Write a protein that binds this ligand. Structure first.
Ligand code: CL
Lengths: 306, 306
């Protein structure tokens, strides 16, 4: 028993992390097969970032201007291309530690682990969610750009995020591994508006099920409610609306606990209107939305990876 | 910026995890050089655990009764010994992925990462603290015994914990890698009393410094206080007393933020007596004690490992 904000084991990703230097700027790259992926703004100086013309800056660069280091193994760049907001550096060596992997574009509310890196070396791993406004609330310092987010399914690494920017508000923005930003953000040092950040309701419900599984049931009540009545309340507190697809995803947790999804919703409704009264759930004094229904099932069933 | 409950990268530990089977029971072992370390209760049946006589049970076992699997590599046991509550299994193969490592016995209030494993395969990684009563509040299911806790300093893995038991209260107990339990616990399925769990004050202060570094300063006040007056209040709320050694450890954070340790203590005193008023600090509605002063400095400075 017990419940923890658990990240994926990072070992398969650690062996893919490299340092990328272009002139004076150094960040992290991801070395898969014979290609290194990194944020295109590795080619910018601090001044360039205010209003970069990436095609013109990249035109001034040649394969030999990029220095790629993996530990004390310098890789040779023999081709380079810009794909959206990522640079693809073709190197002469295939990464011997390349895992089975895929690139995936996740949806808001999905969770993943981040391996925070500096100078191509791993610092720490943590789990986070893609917020509904396509930001992440990370922990990143200067030099962490190119750090990656991932999931694992059995033996395959799904890369879903590359870190690019800290917004002036302290939240973080990045791209998929095809270089398309999540959200309306651009890789420019300019004021940028993130939308309203709503709470991921389907995830809150999942965590309430986790709480029940683990012996925390004080919040269970014998009211019930309808999906429309619940969404009416959710929206007042900036909670995402629940759809039938969400009810479908929660089914297995409903079955395991004997608590129907709409009954759990009525419990949530009461917590929203009346608060937690200085009580806690799974050691938390706030409702938690960084566990998906799949995360809960995974943690409560002991799934492993190879 | 940002602050996250960050675990160490787990890759160096992943390659040390093996499955250990003795008759019908299977758990995790730690393979370093040519020795496998695992909980001695791998030799017990479910019935044996109520009142095991470990010497007599072990006397019935021979090297060939233990099955050690690392992926699809079966290791041969050629010698075995019991050291306190761990079994040392001498195997015929040195682990090629043995990191630089040491065994350390940590003190209450220190933090470490746990790599939760099942059947010798990693499931997830999370960071936790040794509580003052020598328990941990983990996430462990059946079969996770032998999962290990560790820290990394540059290139060296310090193993500090092996998981052995879930107490009837849902909290977790285990040993150092010499097999000595943390706390007064025994590897027997019997009711066991953990002490009062106090809050780790030096860690709370560290996290308050982290909050300031990250822009959360609403809780700063212009009261001050003395160490004795503060400890008088701490004890009323089941907080560990602060000593001069703790004040010494916080010095660098004091210097970086310009806030003296005793001033930070007066801020804490006010939060204890008046609560947080439905406000948050670093996204939390409770005071957090699972970051040490070293963790804060490490996360706020970007330390990496090799
Ligand atoms: Cl909280």
């Amino acid at each position: 028993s017990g419940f923890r904000k658990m990240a994926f084991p990072s070992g398969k990703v650690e062996g893919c992390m490299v340092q990328v230097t272009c002139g004076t700027t150094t960040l992290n790259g991801l070395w898969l097969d014979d290609v290194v992926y990194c944020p295109r703004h590795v080619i910018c100086t601090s001044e360039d970032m205010l209003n970069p013309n990436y095609e013109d800056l990249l035109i001034r660069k040649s394969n030999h201007n990029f220095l790629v280091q993996a530990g004390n193994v310098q890789l040779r760049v023999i081709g380079h291309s810009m794909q959206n907001c990522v640079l693809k550096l073709k190197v002469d060596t295939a990464n011997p530690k390349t895992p089975k992997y895929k690139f995936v574009r996740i949806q808001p509310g999905q969770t993943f682990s981040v391996l925070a890196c500096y100078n191509g070396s791993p610092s720490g791993v943590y789990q986070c969610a893609m917020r509904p406004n396509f930001t992440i609330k990370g922990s990143f310092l200067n030099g962490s750009c190119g750090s990656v987010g991932f999931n694992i399914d059995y033996d395959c690494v799904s890369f879903c995020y590359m870190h690019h920017m800290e917004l002036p508000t302290g939240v973080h923005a990045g791209t998929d591994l095809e270089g398309n930003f999540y959200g309306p953000f651009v890789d420019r040092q300019t004021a940028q508006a993130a939308g309203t950040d709503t709470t991921i309701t389907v995830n809150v419900l999942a965590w309430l099920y986790a709480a029940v599984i683990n012996g925390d049931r004080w919040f269970l009540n014998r009211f019930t409610t309808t999906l429309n009545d619940f969404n009416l309340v959710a929206m007042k507190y900036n909670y995402e609306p629940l759809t039938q697809d969400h009810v479908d995803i929660l089914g297995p947790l409903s079955a395991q606990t004997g608590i129907a999804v709409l009954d759990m919703c009525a419990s949530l409704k009461e917590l929203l209107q009346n608060g937690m009264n200085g009580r806690t759930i799974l050691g938390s004094a706030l409702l938690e939305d960084e566990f998906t229904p799949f995360d809960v099932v995974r943690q409560c069933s002991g799934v492993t990876f190879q």
